Design an enzyme around this catalytic site. Structure first.
Site, PDB file in Angstrom:
ATOM      1  N   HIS B  55       0.808  -1.222   0.000  1.00 14.44           N
ATOM      2  CA  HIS B  55       0.000   0.000   0.000  1.00 14.44           C
ATOM      3  C   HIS B  55       0.826   1.249   0.000  1.00 14.44           C
ATOM      4  O   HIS B  55       0.337   2.301  -0.367  1.00 14.44           O
ATOM      5  CB  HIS B  55      -0.996   0.074   1.165  1.00 14.44           C
ATOM      6  CG  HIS B  55      -0.371   0.387   2.492  1.00 14.44           C
ATOM      7  ND1 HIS B  55      -0.040  -0.593   3.407  1.00 14.44           N
ATOM      8  CD2 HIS B  55      -0.057   1.569   3.078  1.00 14.44           C
ATOM      9  CE1 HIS B  55       0.445  -0.027   4.502  1.00 14.44           C
ATOM     10  NE2 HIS B  55       0.445   1.283   4.327  1.00 14.44           N
ATOM     11  N   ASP B  85       0.302  -7.831   1.979  1.00 15.62           N
ATOM     12  CA  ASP B  85       0.595  -6.405   1.822  1.00 15.62           C
ATOM     13  C   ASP B  85       2.099  -6.105   1.794  1.00 15.62           C
ATOM     14  O   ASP B  85       2.533  -5.073   2.299  1.00 15.62           O
ATOM     15  CB  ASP B  85      -0.086  -5.568   2.913  1.00 15.62           C
ATOM     16  CG  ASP B  85       0.034  -4.056   2.657  1.00 15.62           C
ATOM     17  OD1 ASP B  85      -0.008  -3.626   1.486  1.00 15.62           O
ATOM     18  OD2 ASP B  85       0.158  -3.282   3.630  1.00 15.62           O
ATOM     19  N   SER B 152       4.818   2.167   8.078  1.00 16.24           N
ATOM     20  CA  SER B 152       4.534   1.032   7.233  1.00 16.24           C
ATOM     21  C   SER B 152       5.720   0.582   6.382  1.00 16.24           C
ATOM     22  O   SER B 152       6.352   1.390   5.691  1.00 16.24           O
ATOM     23  CB  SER B 152       3.338   1.376   6.339  1.00 16.24           C
ATOM     24  OG  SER B 152       2.174   1.368   7.146  1.00 16.24           O
TER      25      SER B 152
END
Lengths: 200, 195, 200
Positions: B55, B85, B152
């Site tokens: 993402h 992810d 992230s």
């Protein structure tokens, strides 16, 4: 199963007993005539003469500044000086029986990853110790994830030995708070005491 | 006396955690390149392969990777896996790259002290501390090491600096963040590179 | 290189205490109305949880980390402390929480909160004891709450706050945007309240 009676709990109580006594609650009071709290924060007793460091935003426009020690003594404080650029302010209290002072190791430097404890009065709950680490430096500010909240400004950030690493000031978001390094805070304090302002 | 500290883990691992920037054309203005999103990445080996989160790099027109030592690179997307992810990037460096410590036989245990390393809010590399709060959260580690927008794709390491996982996202909930366990991350990475 | 070093860890506290912390579900006529945590205090099946978690329950369900699931009986509750005592009847032995009646909690001690936040499954979070009671009037309205920055969320109420030895320090209360401010009923008081609710 097991007997933990003689085992020792992991703890930072030694840093607390060493530093916490020197961290005070600071109240900014305004005068219809009654005196009420307009805002609050914390401060750190830097030496025996009763000089205390806190944040300028905590004492701005105070009609009266009150300092409360963890041992019960309360004082009306004198504003020695303040500095907007560093958001620092110095107070003076006139104590009779001796004052507890924050441990300062002039040769210690905070390192990223060092365990630190934030000491202050979040939400007027009363003195509160929270734990985290030095997250980054240079920011200059120290950054830490030791939980900081409204009421912690002007209080101490100490390492596991109780040595002052900085003065908590800003809270950015989870676990993002900032402190002014103790070397800078000490320098600003001396200038405020000597000149009444920071000459630049 | 010696201050308690995780600085050793930081010096061993932080050098290999990079700041990742996803730049896209501003199609509402004049298509100028601008930062659309950002996160972190972990340099896995000397060849320059980096793990980040899918993402973070989705739809990027340009992927920039910045190292803590000052070097900046444009990176190439090797592939991604939506289920976990994860995404793998490749940079072409010379002079050597810092890599993340990996102990393929270390087993992450609930309660182990961990450090999340990343670039929250683009403030510059940040280290936060917590513990491994749970495992198998489905194959995800859970941690209370503070994670924020910008973390992230970064590293979750133990006190020895060994990679425990790749931080992905945090669950106002306080102290609930998740990471892809390192064994899985590594398996996924080799597959994406290979196939 | 780091092959022989040992990661810093509180896994021992986890292994000693977490098996005794249960997931509590308050079900209402129709499904799940609310949930929390509980702590198995003794082998007979007596469990402490918070009153608000089980208030108005038609059926109270207790799930153990070992996978066993029971229907619990409400033995009694006390709105002052917000504590409730449940009773489960099991054929197999039951894991119980370590209690060291001589342990004195200290400000600064490392603690782990154990519970089921958001029904994600048992979760361990780490912090320190931020305060052990208050001498004066304060926002909690009480004087004996333990305060901690171990992260507490909805679902943690009624669960355990233990030190690094796995010893019960307290029962986490309802969740308090403040960050790192959570409260627990000290174990000495929880133990006394439980005994009173079991006898009468």
């Amino acid at each position: 199963q097991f007997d933990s009676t003689d085992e020792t709990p992991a703890s930072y109580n030694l840093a607390v007993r060493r530093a916490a006594p020197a961290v005070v609650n600071v109240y900014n009071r305004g005068l219809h005539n009654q005196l009420e709290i307009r805002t609050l924060g914390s401060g750190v007793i830097m030496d025996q003469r009763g000089y205390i460091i806190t944040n300028k935003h905590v004492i701005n426009d105070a009609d009266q500044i009150i300092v409360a020690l963890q041992d019960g003594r309360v004082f009306e404080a004198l504003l020695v000086g303040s500095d907007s650029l560093t958001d620092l302010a110095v107070l003076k209290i006139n104590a009779t029986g001796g004052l507890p002072t924050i441990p300062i190791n002039a040769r210690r430097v905070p390192h990223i990853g060092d365990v630190v404890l934030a000491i202050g009065n979040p939400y007027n709950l009363g003195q509160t110790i929270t734990q985290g680490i030095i997250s980054a430096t240079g920011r200059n500010f120290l950054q830490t994830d030791a939980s900081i909240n409204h009421g912690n400004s002007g209080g101490a950030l100490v390492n596991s030995l109780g040595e002052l690493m900085g003065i908590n000031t800003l809270s950015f978001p989870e676990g993002i708070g900032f402190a002014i390094p103790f070397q800078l805070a000490t320098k600003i304090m001396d200038k405020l005491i000597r000149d009444g302002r920071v000459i630049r």
